[PDB]
Structures are given as C-alpha cells and as structure tokens.
Design a protein around this ligand. Structure first.
Ligand SMILES: Cc1cc2nc3c(=O)[nH]c(=O)nc-3n(C[C@H](O)[C@H](O)[C@H](O)COP(=O)(O)OP(=O)(O)OC[C@H]3O[C@@H](n4cnc5c(N)ncnc54)[C@H](O)[C@@H]3O)c2cc1C
Length: 498
C-alpha cells in the first residue's frame, strides 16, 4: 500500500521526524510527505505517551510492543518500552555503552520519556548558530513544537519547596540563565484533566494529522536510502507484517532513526562519510535519592491518577555552566527516567530523586561501527560500540558525585550516603554520530541545514546531529536543528516552482 513516489520521505517517527513533518505541513502544505516507522502504533493518537493509557494491562502491553524485533540477563536490564543491544555494546578492554537502548514504536522514545527540555548553556551551545541569533529562534520554535511549559506543577501544595531549598545554597555569582529554576517540560493536560508527557503526538499536531498530503506507515522498515545521479532518490521499505519490499521515490529523504540506527541506515545504503558513527557521546549519569525534611503533609491528597502524573514537587532544573559542568534535575519519582526509590505511602511526595549528567570528552574513537556480515533482529548491519572514558571523564564524574550529594543534602536526608554512577548508556542521550559542521572538512556528517555532505537531498535529524559536548537533555536541541532543516527543505520545495 506504499506510494510510488512522494516529495519528502521521513524514516523515524519520534520528535525529530515529527518535527520535519509538522514544519513542512506548516510552510509546505503542497508537498506530499510519507513517514515510515518500523515499530507498531501503541497509543492514541499515534505517538502519544503510554501514560495516556488508563488500563494497566494495556499500558504494559504498549510498552512490551515497543521493545524491538523480539517482542511478538538480570544484571543488564532495559527500562520498559526500550530494549538493549544483545551484543556489540562493548569491545575488549573498553568501557563500552552496556545499556545503550532503543525504542521501536510510533512516537519513538518520546512515547516513554520524562519530558525535560532545558536549553543548552555556555559551551554546550552550537556557536555558529548562536552568533547569528538563530539558535534562540530555533529553540523557541522547538519549545512551541513540544508545548514546553515551566508552570505545570505550580498549583501543587509542594510547589517551590525544592527550588527554595536549592536557591538557599546556590552561589550568588550565577545569573538568571544559570540559577535554580523550574524545569521546562514537554507536558500537557488531557481535556479530561490529567497532566501527561508530550511527544510525537504533540509535535505532529492536528496540522499534520489533518494534512491530506501526509501519511504514516507504521511497521515499515527502511532498509536502504536510494541514491541516484549523486542525489538522494528514495527509500526501500519493507512491510514488517508481509515482508514485501517496495521502492518509494523521493526528492528529499530525512533519516531521523535515533543516533545509532541513522548511521546504521546510511552505512547500509553505502553513504559513508568518515565522520559517520564517530564522535559518539553518552552523558554519564549520577543519581541520588533524598527524603525531604520539614514536610507539611496534605490533609486530603488525591491518590495517584489512573492516567498521567501526580502533582507533588515537580521537576527543578540546576543549569549547566562552564564553571560547574553538570546538568542537574530534581524530580518527583513518577517524573524520573530511572527507578531510584519507592515513595513513602505514609507521606506521598516526600522522597525525591536527583540526577546529574556529565559532558563527554569527545573522541574520534568513540563510535558505532557496523558489520559486513552480521545483522540485528531487523536484518540491518549489526553494531559494535567503541567507547572509552578518558581521565577527564573520570575527573568530571567525581565532581558530579560530590555536587549531587551537596545538592541532595540541601533538600533532605539522603536515602544512601553516596550517589550511584549509572552504567554507560543509561542517560539515553546519544549525540554526535551524524554531527553538523560549518564545512565539509571530514569532521562532520552534515551541514548546518542538516544536509549530509556528498549526498544532497539526504537529511539527518535527532540528538545525533548535536556536534558539541553537552550535559543537558538533548531532545529540545535536536528538534530545534530539525526546525532549521525542515525550513530549508520548504525553501527548496517552494523554489522548485522554477
Ligand atoms: C524513560 C526515558 C526518559 C527520557 N527522558 C528525557 C528527558 O527528560 N529529556 C530529553 O530530552 N530526553 C529524554 N529521553 C530521551 C528522548 O526520548 C530522546 O532524546 C528522543 O526521543 C529522541 O528523538 P528522535 O526522534 O531523535 O529518536 P527516537 O525518539 O528514537 O525515534 C526514532 C524512531 O525511528 C524509528 N526507526 C529507527 N530505524 C528505523 C528504520 N530503520 N526503519 C523505520 N523506522 C526506524 C525507531 O523505531 C524510532 O521509533 C528519555 C527517554 C526515555 C526512554
């Protein structure tokens, strides 16, 4: 049932592919757009967060259906809704990324995420985009695409307690962009009431869902980018249910398949610039849990809602600075990406999690490589992950450990006297494998318009495009770069009237 040809073909249905779809439905409403996603549709509207599902059985089922090719080792475990590499996650003598993870479903990982959307600060910021002022406009556009808000928790009885206690011990030398503040969150209220995380449902929006020139094929594996006469020419799509392959022609191909499957697809298609898969970076994650002190109990608590989130302390943001190079977030437990502790039923909302994230010392040898012979559960070239912590990595991680204890003691009594360094890959923030650069000099995969050097008309999208060393949650930034790329494709299409 696939089209013979469309104008733009998008592989991937998380916020990056969705960003391209929505921006072209806005600025290029005349263009036909096909989106191919290998995973099933597990939520309504497609791409919506699993916490929209009220029945616990159905919700657990949506999660299990997102967990990869085998979905129809107790010491190396994936969070629900994601799956790990079965092998190739670590080479001899290397740290590797033991819990590098993926999601395969409409909505991508954003059907399962915890929605935190900070802006990059200081050296995390892409400078050639920051100098023109365009970076701020792109980040504003991404906040619009994700419906990002800071106020979602401002009415709860515990509003501001965590922010107050942190501000008490925060250096009087930081300015507004750097002081303790609310986390900006990709969250919205359901018409029936409950707060819930926002994903590709929100990025796609009613403008994409109502666009008669747009189509979404779930359970559709892209095995190849068709290149012809120098340019991107289309995609090869396998219907996962019947197994038949078909070519879809396209003047534009956007690959937003996450930071490791996007290089996978490009390698399988013979598009192999030297930077492809290289400069891969995860954000080492340190976690901590504390019981808040001096906690006025609420006389008539609501009892956890059957969809969406509870409203306890919310999420606070402790911003990255060059001088203090960790992204910090303090979270009520149902907003943490990692199970840290159980809430006290005697005092709901009093146990809070903390996570600090480090910036990686970027290395050429930190990469994802691919096999000529072996294949994964989708029949795509199998990955081998090469990843080493430098001494600078270890030094900054030790700093993060001391700082997370200092921040947690300011809030309450720690559940443990020392924090925990999560296994590498646990942050689920993988950047750099298809990084943008100013010039085709071998050190980048794509241009500032996200177009890959040497394959005009081929575009890349997601956290893999971020070329800098970052600590903060990357999705907002990946979506912002997607905004620039999709605007460029719209420019090209409207100009095609020549
Ligand atoms: C529990 C959890 C908590 C998180 N918390 C945060 C947070 O607070 N802040 C933040 O910024 N991020 C967070 N993240 C990470 C966030 O989900 C990702 O950064 C974001 O989803 C990246 O979007 P993407 O579209 O680039 O890739 P993805 O979200 O992975 O989507 C890519 C899609 O491409 C599809 N695809 C891949 N290959 C093919 C193919 N070959 N053919 C067809 N389809 C293909 C995949 O199946 C997937 O659906 C969290 C993630 C999880 C799991």
């Amino acid at each position: 049932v696939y089209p013979a040809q469309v104008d733009v073909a998008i592989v991937g249905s998380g916020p990056a592919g969705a960003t391209y779809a929505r921006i072209l439905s806005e600025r290029a409403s005349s263009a036909t757009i096909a989106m191919f996603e290998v995973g099933p549709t597990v939520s309504d509207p497609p791409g919506a967060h699993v916490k929209n599902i009220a029945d616990a059985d159905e919700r657990a089922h949506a999660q299990r259906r997102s967990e990869g090719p085998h979905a129809r080792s107790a010491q190396r475990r994936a969070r629900p809704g994601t799956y790990l590499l079965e092998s190739g996650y670590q080479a001899d003598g290397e740290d590797g990324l033991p819990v590098a993870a993926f999601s395969s479903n409409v909505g991508g990982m954003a059907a399962h995420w915890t929605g935190a959307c900070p802006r990059p600060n200081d050296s995390e910021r892409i400078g050639f985009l920051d100098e023109t002022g365009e970076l701020d406009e792109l980040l504003s556009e991404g906040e619009r695409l994700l419906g990002v808000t800071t106020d979602a928790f401002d009415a709860s009885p515990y509003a501001g307690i965590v922010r107050e206690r942190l501000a008490a011990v925060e250096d009087a030398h930081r300015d507004a962009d750097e002081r303790v503040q609310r986390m900006p969150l990709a969250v919205h209220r359901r018409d029936d009431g409950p707060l819930v995380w926002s994903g590709s449902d929100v990025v796609l929006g009613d403008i994409t869902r109502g666009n008669p020139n747009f189509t979404l094929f779930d359970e559709s594996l892209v095995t190849r980018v068709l290149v012809e006469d120098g340019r991107a020419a289309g995609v090869v799509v396998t219907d996962v249910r019947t197994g038949e392959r078909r070519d879809v022609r396209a003047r534009f191909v956007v690959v937003a398949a996450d930071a490791l499957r996007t290089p996978q697809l490009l390698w399988a298609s013979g598009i192999r610039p030297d930077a492809l898969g290289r400069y891969l970076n995860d954000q080492a994650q340190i976690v901590f849990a504390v019981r808040m002190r001096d906690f006025t109990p609420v006389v008539d608590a609501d009892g956890v809602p059957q969809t969406g989130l509870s409203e306890y302390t919310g999420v606070t943001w402790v911003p990255f600075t060059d001088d203090m190079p960790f992204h910090g977030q303090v979270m009520q437990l149902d907003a943490s990406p990692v199970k840290l502790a159980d809430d006290d039923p005697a005092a709901p909302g009093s146990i809070v999690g903390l996570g600090l994230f480090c910036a990686k010392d970027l290395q050429a040898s930190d990469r994802v490589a691919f096999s000529d012979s072996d294949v994964d559960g989708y029949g795509m070239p199998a990955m081998q992950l090469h990843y080493t912590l430098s001494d600078r990595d270890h030094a900054t991680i030790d700093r993060a450990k001391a700082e997370i204890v200092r921040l947690g003691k300011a809030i309450g009594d720690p559940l443990d006297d020392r924090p925990f360094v999560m296994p590498l890959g646990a942050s689920l923030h993988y950047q750099g494998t298809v990084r943008m650069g100013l010039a085709d000099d071998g050190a980048s995969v794509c241009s500032p318009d996200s177009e890959v050097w040497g394959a005009p008309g081929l575009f890349v999208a997601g956290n893999g495009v971020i070329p800098t060393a970052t600590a903060c949650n990357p999705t907002l930034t990946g979506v912002a770069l997607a905004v620039r790329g999709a605007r460029h494709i719209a420019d090209e299409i409207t100009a095609d009237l020549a």
